[model samples]
Target: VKVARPCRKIEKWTYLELKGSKANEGVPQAMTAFAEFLNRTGIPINPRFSPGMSMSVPGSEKEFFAKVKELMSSHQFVVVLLPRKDVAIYNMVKRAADITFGVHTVCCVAEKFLSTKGQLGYFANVGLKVNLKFGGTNHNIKTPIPLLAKGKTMVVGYDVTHPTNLAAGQSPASAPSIVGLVSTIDQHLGQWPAMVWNNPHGQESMTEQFTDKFKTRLELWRSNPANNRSLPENILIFRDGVSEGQFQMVIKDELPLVRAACKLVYPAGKLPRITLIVSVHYTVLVDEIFRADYGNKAADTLEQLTHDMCYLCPPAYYADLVCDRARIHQKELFDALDENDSVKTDDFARWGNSGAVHPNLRNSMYYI
Candidate 1:
């Protein structure tokens, strides 16, 4: 039997491509192919983005502002084709367009634009993300079913990405660490609203604003009338880039911050049950059951239950824990989540947590 899908088809849309560094012979043909692909996939994209208006400008911030200003005067949607070197341009355009003009933009690597047939699917997926961010939905995709069965449940995906450390002589405010917390707002735990905060330099165990950011998501979740309760019944936190040695710090430092946020919103007597699961590392294991819905057996079923969740309304960022981003493009995360139950105990032992596993983290599993 076929699984159910997500929301409706993107029948009509319009897009504009801002040229980045390399505008070669392949770019024209690639744009044509992308348009055809979009139309064929039910996302009918019109080409005349800024009619009667010229879209040419230099690469300076002011010139970018002028071109984007004119482009925004006519078009609502913009897509950029950026070369590998001009990442700064991509960032510049996004900050100006999204922050100032309040317009959303999607980007495709210009050098590799339509380099292969499979890339058509990548652009289509990008189209899906654009559609969703502009307050749209998809059709014929799987959504998590039993996640919030009892009451409203929030599935939080947390990541702490550290930028490369400074060189010996380099002296600036040490590159601040980025802490991102994405919490589910919709009933299905699919519509994730994300907030990113910068942890100060040298401050590893930050217990301050985690609660502040989390409270915003909690309040936003309650604002929706479709939810079961005004507050979530439980919260499941899936953390990344954390080792077992830091488990106690998380329990002692971060855990209380979450609790404080809970009490701030909720009364003293009522608080959501929080299950904190850490993604041990990026190591890929054959049949690792990270966290199951209905026990061990239920985790596999849950993977199947919502396998294609990303394709419909894709995550804003990559979930590299489940699949490889570079070489392996097409791994079935749903099937792979619980691919087999015969994973050896020694395989699990190989991924030791430096020292011993903290007793508090026994409830969580490392979904390799």
Candidate 2:
């Protein structure tokens, strides 16, 4: 007589690449949540984007393609996409499914990810059918149409303490790490953004190069934005890395461009029904969480839950924290009220706040 055997669950390979410059993040996740919102609403997701990758870094096509190809061969890409808008808005995007399979918007500047705004975008509505290898037969995966609709999402954040005399990204050794977080009504799930950062031998500009490349991709994707509008619904960048002295400097600079890009990608209306903005202060925990979805995780809830969690800096932004700005440091976030175990507490919240001061930001695209 043989004892009953426990069945082992298969852990399919799902690759996560978070090579961004921000220290803390939730915004990217919120953008991602929009996809779930569509799914739950019974809106078909883009097929090519069965899964997607985040491409918010700055680099040439050769540079990015090389890296991605290597990764693809090593670990197959279920999908890859970003939510940021810029030079590479939707210029070189492609998906090979018989039906339109890829319709996810992602971050970047000059990427070959999507096409541009001609007189009008050629309707890319077709079905995506993929044959999977199964026992003695090919399993067909059917993909539906581009689901277009409105979605609203919000991100909540807090900051830890410790002051700093060291300038931001002054040294390679001193530079702090960045993270992008996302959660769903069911659980914490997300996609990180391409980070902006500083390296030791870094040039006069940034190290991660997220902004530059993001802009470049936009130029390529929709060089003629006069007739284009294909940006994300909204984005909220939590300024955790900045000091009170550095907050406004970043927000004034970062907010408008992102907002414009999102606007450009959206349909031209008298005005966007929704607008994107940036914040650097703590929002009520119960409110943010319950809204993102504390009840049964619904599609609308999942969409908002994961698509908008971008908190900057983690543990602390400054290498030389005098321990004076503990409240503003990126540490110790409140637990999810809807969660149960300690697993939910590990990285409880993508907490931080410092959007009070900083350099003045200029939109890359100035309105004529």
Candidate 3:
């Protein structure tokens, strides 16, 4: 495989090792292996390791938070060596680092790192994730996508996940749905920063905040130095989680929101060409880009572009993962409330804001 150069390189980072009573014996070996993996990937990273760097933290939330906050004062990125694969501890680490402190963190299980085998492969995967989270591109399409390369195009993926099925014995009213929208910030279609909204349970249509959130995405795209501060000429939206019965809602409800957001962002009569596709389970609903004619090149181009996009992290999949990560942020708030307690409307609004990640990670692929 031809590896594309990383868009950004890490200059400095710290390793926050979570150790137990016996202490981690394999940390130095794991670090050496990880550094070698980074060198193989051609990613330049400086390890801030010293004898008294205070990089080690105990397996406690209080200590973890304290060390994380302290590290953030000097380092923007941190590699966390977790004691085990515990979901509660993992969620706490993510919540504190991503939402509370806004530090870039990548966690690895102690067992895997200490294992005698598969160290290189596991560290390689971790290195890729760390690069992506640090605003670096792992690879790029050598063959330019006609849709994105031909013009200033913005690709967006949107999805809303409800906790109705995930949370058992709790009323859906207490658990708000998460609306995840991710759009490409650069022309390479690699940098997708996500914006999340907390919607009422069972509400699929993004009516209230759709236009504003879409406008935010447009602003982010325009703010990029590569785009020359110009608006995108074409906007491709890949919408997920909608059924056949709700396909009409795409055109009727969400399509107008896209146009309205463009109108507000661009100058008068300078709206971008917008296309919305509903990518369901093994299905594709072409809304605005295709004609009824058979064997059309436009259809082919769209198909090829869609197929090629899957090779990368598809916007819909990224949005889905962002929503899933958002749930982890909301776990503390939801767990604090009693199941039998009736949740007020205002309380739900407050809970919705609880899932918002830190501003520092807002524009990066922190979810990945």
Candidate 4:
């Protein structure tokens, strides 16, 4: 038995249990810097065993469910990695013989916390990975909301979650600005993806309480549209957390109530047209380039908003004293970002390639 420092078998892994509350000072350093960043981007990576896949770490709530249930009582063939809203605190830290969720989108960017360099990149984290087009009947809107208003046409997804001291009336030192509203009755299947609807919440005038609670719930359901409704010709609004100097104050106070709440819900020529889906915060769109929403020239507006609903592409951190786990960057690990050669390229044959596209535009490449 004569061996001297020679160990490199390296083909066994088990990081499938991740909870929060500073979850062991950075999910064990993102599982040892994504296994040494896939051992130097040798690509061809593995180690994603299944079963109760509750991996999480994004805008966590309640201090990661009151301390991730005592690290879920000694693991044994477990797989917990949460975030699609904590999945009931990873199923109360148990009862998850099989579950999966996502949106760690480059280390949860911020719902509050995770920017000591977006928590060290998280190895190619592309987010929104829950499938079946993702949530609220996939955002066509449901829950007896007239079953998405007798379905016909309605592709909507608004937004307005603000912070920075609500300007004055601060509570808990201010942090409440979520004015989301999703809709979609297959308006051309242009695909709004499905935010469904969220609003976050504030009190006073966080933009006049987000335009009077979304203009009185879209003016009492389109000022009575049960008489003869059929609008949704084209209304693709997707704000979901604004920026870019509040982007013209979200286009001068929520774009005229989002074009009068999509032509007052609908009736005349199915009026409901508007398009503006800017979740801009890729490090503040790369620290706001020219400023007309020009941060690193908007990663080709994220490849044309995935040319549909979500093509994700924002996760690349670890520079300040770079620990050098091979920098698991995204946006292609920066390099003169975008030098006006017009930098827009991601057509991918009108968008294909990815488990075979076309499932409602597939993540924009399947609900990514």
Candidate 5:
């Protein structure tokens, strides 16, 4: 495959390190290597090497928060070098930078920076994420996407996460499930705006706020200047997390909500063509246009589109990530409560509040 240049470059960024670790010693060399990798990838970045605060402990949330705020005063981004692969510190950093401060951060382990072998490859991988978080596309397919290339198409992915283990004697309804939605906003099929919501546990269908949430996404796509303030002519949906038995339930329960949202958004007689596919494990259930539009080539066309566009729809893949990241945001709340204790109704409300990402990152791939 040919290299795809980043749509935008990181113009100004700096690094933050742990005070007592090898991160302080390795970051100087890592920055040089990372810059070289960026130049080679056609996304050259200007690293602001000005001194930034080094936290005394990797898990110090207060110190990390203050340091990130100070760095954001002069830099557009920050690359945090962790002392090790510690989830507690990682979550703390993400909550602070991504939620509280809205500062874009790319985290790397200290060992990755200290190692000289295959350093360029590692930096390149990290750079791909940085470019995406910095609002740039890493690659674009040269071939035309079947329905998408012909007109304005909005591809959407849907997913829901239920509580893994219920509190000792607590009823399942006390636990809140998370719903994630991701939709394409541009022709490049690169920029996807994600939305997350809290719902009743084990509810596969997004019935509560599906209409309102989907309308918000449609408005976002139409508002983009590149789209010329026009509604999409086609809407392709890839839904995940449904069991085989619930396939008909999705068609009956969820499909109407989707059309209802479109009806509310588009003017009379302007509803876009809709295709809904339910993907369980690796099997896919296609509805409407996948067979009718392509005729004899329907099977081949659908296969090719699924393969060429991505393994499955990336919108769905991203929605899964968003759900997981939102759960991470509530790590503290979950950790505080005892496993045997019955969760309070107020705790369910806190889950929703904690799961929300900063408004600035809602439209970006910050979950990645």
Candidate 6:
């Protein structure tokens, strides 16, 4: 049976493969199976391997980026195969993608991707991830969100996880904190990519990048095709990692920025109804356009998407990577965000297409 669906099929894209500090045994077979799984799931992909590649086990950060930049100059996507014991490789791969030209990468242990038992479920989901990362929409709908039907709506989530003051060997003075600020990229409110920041000065209690990050997302949301080029009618921001004692802290610091973002993005005196929810211990509070509970049966699907995205890219690991890269490359993008700072988009020009920074905000946002 043939079915017509709103969601577009994933586009065919070329990908490159690399091996971690593990003995290469079944990587080729794993790659072949993963490719076939993607094809079966409606995402046609062409993956090629460049042999005799080595970043040098336990090599300098400079050497790693040198090789990565060389390979990335010709490839849009990369699949890194690593050993289970090689956990540190995760930090390296993520940092490379996060700091570089928004390269799309997937990293997993060779034992899992190269499973001899023929497991395809894992790679199938990964295919979905790849589709989104490569600027392909997996699903869509004829009717837009009703509340946003007349205009647009932006659903956002914010999280900041502070690093441990003292690690196994590191001193308290050297430890840095991490923050994850994410928001919607599409009209459906499904795709929520994150901007990672690190404060190496040990200022874990403060976040200086939320305002600019929020402004960047607000600008991008207004530019989506599904939105018909209009500003949102409702802005729902879910603030996570908030504790019982930080009510005044969030309201005094973050709330003002939210208001500032509204004033900046919306038409004069036409701000959307902002609903901010602070989640910790399942607590619920409402101000303007606010409500919480599983009471709305219609919103189950939406909740699921948020749930998966939350677990999919673990913030703790992300913070670790930010700190890890900061320690070595010193190329971490620290936001320096404050309520007074604003996102300026004066000289941006949209060009080409996605698989890099978003075309709409060509000079601004990345696939990340």
- The lDDT values for all models are 0.49, 0.27, 0.72, 0.33, 0.72, 0.52
Tens-digit lDDT string for candidate 1 (1-368): 11122323333323445543445445556656765665565553554333222243364777787666756544555566655446556556554554446455576665566477577767677655554454434444433455545446666666664333335542233333445556667655434555544454423425556878678878877887767448887776666656665555556667678778888898679887676655553221111223433566645654453354444312223323212211111112112325553223233222212112223211111111
Residue 252 lDDT, candidate 6, scale 0-100: 72
Full-model lDDT, candidate 4: 0.33
How does candidate 2 score on lDDT? 0.27
Report the poorest 10 consecutive residues by lDDT, candidate 6: 346-355
Cα error, residue 143 of model 3, in Å, equals 1.3
- TM-score leader: 5
Question: Could you estimate the TM-score for every candidate?
Answer: 0.63, 0.26, 0.87, 0.25, 0.88, 0.68
- Judged by lDDT against the true structure, how good is candidate 5? 0.72
By TM-score, is 3 or 6 better? 3
The residue pairs that clash in candidate 6, if any, are 208-337, 209-337
Greater TM-score among 3 and 4 belongs to: 3
lDDT score, candidate 2, position 222: 35
Task: Please give the clash total of every predicted structure, in order.
Answer: 10, 97, 0, 16, 0, 2
Residue-level lDDT of model 4, residues 161-261, one tens digit each, is 33223245423312333233434333222222222111222322344444444444344333334414333343334454444555665566556655564
Best to worst by lDDT, what's the order?
A: 5, 3, 6, 1, 4, 2
Clashing pairs in 1: 5-140, 5-141, 6-138, 6-139, 6-140, 6-141, 7-138, 7-139, 8-138, 285-368
Q: Give the least accurate 10-residue stretch of model 5, judged by summed lDDT.
A: 166-175
Among all windows of ten consecutive residues in candidate 2, which has the lowest summed lDDT?
126-135
- Pick out the ten consecutive residues of candidate 4 with the lowest summed lDDT: 314-323
The TM-score obtained by model 2 is: 0.26
How much is the lDDT of residue 363 in candidate 1? Answer: 14
The better candidate by TM-score, 2 or 6, is 6
Query: Please, what are the lDDT tens digits per residue for candidate 3 over residues 267-341?
Result: 898877767778655344544443422246666777778777876538788888888888888764466444633
Backbone clashes in model 4: 16
